[PDB]
Write a protein that binds this ligand. Structure first.
Ligand code: AKG
Ligand code: FE
Length: 199
């Protein structure tokens, strides 16, 4: 559907329960927080990070920081389940040398959305982003290299993994307002993990 993207549906289905337990452990150290955009709007999506570097708004802009500005401590270490899952998915997609040093964790409550954006804050744009979906289904939308490219829509469900490589690495993308529902593991939300090579 997208040049350079590898969709691995249900790839993390068996690992989901451990991933969610580790999400909670990470969040007990660096809690979920709704960040303020450089434009002054509070994001409806709640976020936190783990790894060497964490994506965060700071000084009226986006940056990767080794410190959590809400705790003044380093981000929690990347759990084993995260590292193992990401390496397995990257290798299967043909990126065996991908070594993420940052994982952004998004939490979507009903009604939460992520507006169209690009992920180009990383110094090496040749490296892929590995995306892991957990919990309630979400409508993922993506266009192309331009704001104005026509959008394609794809449902992402519990356990789906996408490796955004090549051209797709630079596409505009976002998430439509999450529909309320029930999931036996996450109850009433969706989690998304995006593994990044940000160093
Ligand atoms: O929630 C998703 O599936 C996409 C998340 C995303 O694009 C991001 O956090 O950069
Ligand atoms: Fe993104």
């Amino acid at each position: 559907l997208a040049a350079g993207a590898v969709i691995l549906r249900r790839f993390a289905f068996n690992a989901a329960e451990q991933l969610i337990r580790d999400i909670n452990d990470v969040a007990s150290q660096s809690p979920f927080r709704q960040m303020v955009t450089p434009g002054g709007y509070t994001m409806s999506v709640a976020m936190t990070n783990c790894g060497h570097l964490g994506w965060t708004t700071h000084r009226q802009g986006y940056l990767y920081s080794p410190i959590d500005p809400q705790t003044n401590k380093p981000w929690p270490a990347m759990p084993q389940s995260f590292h193992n899952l990401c390496q397995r998915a990257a290798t299967a997609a043909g990126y065996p040398d991908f070594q993420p040093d940052a994982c952004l964790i998004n939490r979507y409550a009903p009604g939460a959305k992520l507006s169209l954006h690009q992920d180009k804050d990383e110094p090496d744009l040749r490296a892929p982003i590995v995306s892991v979906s957990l919990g309630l289904p979400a409508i993922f939308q993506f266009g192309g290299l331009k704001r104005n490219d026509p959008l394609k829509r794809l449902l992402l469900e519990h356990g789906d993994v996408v490796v955004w490589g090549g051209e797709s690495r630079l596409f505009y993308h976002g998430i439509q307002p999450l529909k309320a529902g029930f999931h036996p593991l996450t109850i009433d939300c969706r989690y998304n993990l995006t593994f990044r090579q940000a160093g």
